[PDB]
Design a protein around this ligand. Structure first.
Ligand SMILES: *[C@@H]1O[C@H](CO)[C@@H](O)[C@H](O)[C@H]1NC(C)=O
Ligand SMILES: *[C@@H]1O[C@H](CO)[C@@H](O)[C@H](O)[C@H]1NC(C)=O
Ligand SMILES: *[C@@H]1O[C@H](CO)[C@@H](O)[C@H](O)[C@H]1NC(C)=O
Ligand SMILES: *[C@@H]1O[C@H](CO)[C@@H](O)[C@H](O)[C@H]1NC(C)=O
Ligand SMILES: *[C@@H]1O[C@H](CO)[C@@H](O)[C@H](O)[C@H]1NC(C)=O
Ligand SMILES: *[C@@H]1O[C@H](CO)[C@@H](O)[C@H](O)[C@H]1NC(C)=O
Ligand SMILES: *[C@@H]1O[C@H](CO)[C@@H](O)[C@H](O)[C@H]1NC(C)=O
Lengths: 49, 361, 100, 100
């Protein structure tokens, strides 16, 4: 379910951000989404450990 | 002054292997007893390369390359003299020329006029070009130089930098490892999309000695390189050649222990598009809000809902007949690729002092 | 220009191909402005006429409705996985095995 | 006099190299753009002519050659580290000891 989290971005779909935003802001939104997913996966890894 | 060649004999090019060739220093970093993996244009191992033989066989081919040509040749009596680099090999564009007579090398890039069959010919004849019109570059360096010698050369063009990697060793390609150290860096900063090989003829019509050279293709991939305690490169590992070297690259070690290891994942690459939406019977009348006979004011604009049609955004993004086009919440580059239900076009006239106000918040 | 983008069945697309369905080919596509990569197979789902696209638990598109054809065209039910390498030590030998 | 800004690789630049060097001291040197702090120490290793600056396991500039002088200098950081204080309870006394 964390894949559907917007994480403060315009949309929760990667291809939507890639096709629906200019690259200077598209890279910002992609970086925000991947760091949110990295934080979520770090939390999952800590819980699993 | 150029002389055409008629006695050429037709023969298709041959192919040989690239077992342990094409390795070079990616940068100028000194390391001591560590294994480092880096991304750079590197020749894959066990890749097929083109072999040309000169004997009465004459091999002067023209092939388009962007960058990264690996030139290896077994050499005796200095048959190979010069090289040609450029885009169209004429006076309309700048072309890079390498020459080397019995004294020293000369590196020059110019809009030289190149004939169809340029070559070299005691050597005192120099017939490779006719005139120079638009150039000012000049560079002079020290001379670089049964089969007895093997010469390998790598030419690269990244970020306007012409990197030359050379290595001379005394001796098909022999089975061995030899790291090609860089020789000289040329800050040319032009484009090159063609090359031509120059050969030297012996006069005693004309006779040509036994020579052979190899042409290779450079590909972007990750190589795991080993730097010894004294800084020289000992071995190379391709991370995408075989699963053994894949495990070596993943574990960052040249020796893998016994057991099950995970390196990467298997994926199916896309090949074709099955986009499934039949096109709409009419086109979008974008000229209604652009070529209207009259416009509305900023406080009370005119909204025309444009929907159920096929749009063309090349006149807005690709072409610029208008003063300023800008998109905040949508990509201006991929405007035609998207699919929306309806668009509300607000047409109004604003003075140049307040046109910056049309933005979110 | 204000875009009601990916909130309703879209009708404004410049280039299109309208390719028919194909099996066992997990490749890219673009359905009404939504991009994906997968096979386009059949299903036994009985979709109501007003329904256009379905969604799974992860809010990922798994169904669509194609105008002028009225078919399923399932969204990305294609195979994927990882590859594992099994080999002994380098001192003994160098043979490797590929496992999916 | 006319110039061109952002059109080709640049070679014409003014002199910003501080006109002097440091031996046996850790300073914030600027070697052609990179900024680092360390003591310039003579290195017994042999450096190939094309090499300019080396990197350690930390991917930091631990070795460099001078842009003009052919001599090679190693970058070693000067004295740095944590410091701890050993003291008894405040009710007993107030004498303290410093330890690095
Ligand atoms: C030789 O090169 C050709 C393409 O030029 C390629 O199709 C062929 O597989 C290569 N041979 C080997 C043994 O890889
Ligand atoms: C070799 O070429 C250079 C290029 O300018 C020239 O100056 C030199 O005289 C040449 N040497 C001989 C022996 O012709
Ligand atoms: C002619 O040469 C000058 C100076 O080298 C250069 O700026 C100009 O672009 C050249 N013209 C053409 C058509 O190449
Ligand atoms: C590559 O060469 C072509 C040949 O005319 C030229 O038009 C193009 O500008 C070059 N690319 C770059 C990045 O200069
Ligand atoms: C739409 O597709 C039809 C063919 O089905 C074609 O004739 C027409 O020119 C295309 N353009 C429109 C009307 O969008
Ligand atoms: C209005 O201007 C556009 C762009 O120049 C042109 O294509 C069109 O034919 C003109 N007339 C109308 C009625 O749209
Ligand atoms: C490595 O270099 C040192 C001097 O820098 C030399 O004494 C030593 O012999 C070299 N190693 C080998 C294996 O030759």
């Amino acid at each position: 379910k964390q894949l559907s989290s917007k994480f403060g971005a315009i949309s929760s779909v990667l291809n939507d951000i890639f096709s629906r935003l200019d690259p200077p802001e598209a890279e910002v939104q992609i970086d925000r989404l991947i760091t949110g997913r990295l934080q979520s996966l770090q939390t999952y890894v800590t819980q699993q450990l | 002054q150029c002389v055409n060649l008629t006695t050429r004999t037709q023969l298709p090019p041959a192919y040989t292997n690239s077992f342990t060739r094409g390795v070079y220093y990616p940068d100028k970093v000194f390391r001591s007893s560590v294994l480092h993996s880096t991304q750079d244009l590197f020749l894959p191992f066990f890749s097929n390369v083109t072999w040309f033989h000169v004997i009465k066989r004459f091999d002067n081919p023209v092939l388009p390359f962007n960058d990264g040509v690996y030139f290896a040749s077994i050499e005796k009596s200095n048959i190979i003299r010069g090289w040609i680099f450029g885009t169209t090999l004429d006076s309309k564009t700048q072309s890079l020329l390498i020459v080397n007579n019995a004294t020293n090398v000369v590196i020059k890039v110019c809009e030289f006029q190149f004939c169809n069959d340029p070559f070299l010919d005691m050597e005192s004849e120099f017939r490779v070009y006719s005139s120079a019109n638009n150039c000012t570059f000049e560079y002079v360096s020290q001379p670089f130089l049964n089969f007895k010698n093997l010469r390998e050369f790598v030419f690269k063009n990244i970020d306007g930098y012409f990197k030359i990697y050379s290595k001379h060793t005394p001796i098909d390609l022999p089975q061995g490892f030899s790291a090609l150290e860089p020789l000289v860096d040329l800050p040319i900063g032009i484009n090159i999309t063609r090359f031509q090989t120059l050969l030297a003829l012996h006069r005693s019509g004309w006779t040509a000695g036994a020579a052979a050279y190899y042409v290779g293709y450079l590909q972007p991939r990750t190589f795991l390189l080993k730097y010894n305690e004294n800084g020289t490169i000992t071995d190379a590992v391709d991370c995408a050649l075989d699963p053994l070297s894949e495990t070596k690259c993943t574990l960052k070690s040249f020796t893998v222990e016994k057991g099950i290891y995970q390196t990467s994942n298997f994926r199916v690459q896309p090949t074709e598009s099955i986009v499934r939406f039949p096109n709409i019977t009419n086109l979008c009348p974008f000229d209604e809000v652009f070529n209207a006979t009259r416009f509305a004011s900023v406080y009370a604009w005119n909204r025309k809902r444009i929907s159920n049609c096929v749009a063309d955004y090349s006149v807005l993004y690709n072409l610029a007949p208008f003063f300023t086009f800008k998109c905040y919440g949508v990509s201006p580059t991929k405007l035609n690729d998207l699919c929306f239900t309806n668009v509300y076009a607000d047409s109004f006239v604003i003075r140049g002092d307040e046109v910056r106000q049309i933005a979110p918040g | 220009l204000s875009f009601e983008l990916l909130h309703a069945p879209a009708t404004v697309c410049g280039p299109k191909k309208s390719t028919n369905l194909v099996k066992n080919k997990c490749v890219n596509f673009n359905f009404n402005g939504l991009k994906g990569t997968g096979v386009l197979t059949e299903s036994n789902k009985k979709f109501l006429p007003f329904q256009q696209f379905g969604r799974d638990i992860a809010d990922t598109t798994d169904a669509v409705r194609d105008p002028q054809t009225l078919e399923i065209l399932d969204i990305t039910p294609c195979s994927f996985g990882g590859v594992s390498v099994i080999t002994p030590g380098t001192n003994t030998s160098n043979q490797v095995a590929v496992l999916y």
